[PDB]
Amino acid sequence: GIVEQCCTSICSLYQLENYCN
Amino acid sequence: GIVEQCCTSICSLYQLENYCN
Amino acid sequence: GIVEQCCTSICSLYQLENYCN
Amino acid sequence: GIVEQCCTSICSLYQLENYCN
Amino acid sequence: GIVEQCCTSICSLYQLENYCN
Amino acid sequence: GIVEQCCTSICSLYQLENYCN
Amino acid sequence: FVNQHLCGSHLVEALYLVCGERGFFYTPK
Amino acid sequence: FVNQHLCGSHLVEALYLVCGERGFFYTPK
Amino acid sequence: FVNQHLCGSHLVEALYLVCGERGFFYTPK
Amino acid sequence: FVNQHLCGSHLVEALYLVCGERGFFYTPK
Amino acid sequence: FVNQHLCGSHLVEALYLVCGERGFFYTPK
Amino acid sequence: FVNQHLCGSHLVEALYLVCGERGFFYTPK
Ligand SMILES: *C(=O)CCCCCCCCCCCCC
Ligand SMILES: *C(=O)CCCCCCCCCCCCC
Ligand SMILES: *C(=O)CCCCCCCCCCCCC
Ligand SMILES: *C(=O)CCCCCCCCCCCCC
Ligand SMILES: *C(=O)CCCCCCCCCCCCC
Ligand SMILES: *C(=O)CCCCCCCCCCCCC
Ligand SMILES: [Cl-]
Ligand SMILES: [Cl-]
Ligand SMILES: [Zn+2]
Ligand SMILES: [Zn+2]
Fold it and tell me: Which chain positions lie within coiled-coil regions (chains A, B, C, D, E, F)?
């Protein structure tokens, strides 16, 4: 889950790329 | 400047990186 | 789409709900 | 108080409706 | 009102203070 | 540091004025 | 508490979207 | 109108920062 | 286009508030 | 937890800037 | 000008996300 | 700490509104 990964540890810009359609 | 380019044309992530320190 | 309707006319809360999962 | 109610517990959309003029 | 003045001309911090409680 | 001063204690508007160019 | 200030900034944008033309009043104290 | 709504979104954010503990009343046109 | 991007920035913020736990799919033009 | 809601509001704006025309899906549950 | 101010508000938010720990200098026209 | 990143996003918007035409520099490290 994006809430369980990028909100408990800081996510770099590429970490946000994974959830893009 | 930054406004003269990105507020008239959409700036890609690489173009934003040119303004980073 | 969502942009074609809500960015030209103000969308009410019910209209936004149509885009929810 | 809105700070003492909607900021210590998550408020739904209707909970924000109460403070509207 | 607030929109009729600040959304057509940039409002300084003193002008915003006039709208404070 | 601005992170070590204005993010551990709440900064007033003038406290943000110090870091302006 | 800085956490109070951050939450208030999200309350004002929630009231603005909900109240709309009616308007809102923010009064923590 | 659409762009008027966008200005108000930043307007309430600016008013929240400037006023602070005093609070404010937001009334649109 | 520039102003279309600005509307989408507030649009996703509005959709996030309205939907909540349900979530949403955002698809631009 | 209110801290979860605040972080999600920053995730939606991060996905919007990253995905752009591709679009994003937000699904906490 | 008003709409130029709005673009800068999202511009600094975008620059903050993209740069991160490096930081940036924001200079308007 | 994620709380640091959230607060920084509110510092950049505060500097933008305060500095205005002068501009600001954000340097956490
Ligand atoms: C839906 O409820 C999401 C499921 C996972 C939620 C985890 C919440 C953990 C509590 C917050 C810890 C981190 C605080 C920044
Ligand atoms: C003005 O000072 C508001 C009066 C009530 C403040 C309560 C603050 C409690 C400390 C924060 C607890 C919740 C943190 C998210
Ligand atoms: C770069 O890493 C900044 C150096 C100072 C960071 C201090 C972080 C302290 C942990 C957060 C405490 C306050 C939480 C709101
Ligand atoms: C709400 O009905 C808004 C009332 C203010 C008038 C809006 C239009 C004023 C003239 C500006 C036209 C510019 C856009 C074509
Ligand atoms: C992406 O290419 C946007 C597609 C939608 C068309 C944008 C222009 C529509 C007509 C409005 C012109 C107003 C600005 C001069
Ligand atoms: C600050 O003074 C802004 C300087 C840049 C010029 C703004 C106007 C450029 C031409 C666009 C006109 C469109 C609005 C009618
Ligand atoms: Cl926050
Ligand atoms: Cl805008
Ligand atoms: Zn926040
Ligand atoms: Zn905007």
Answer: none
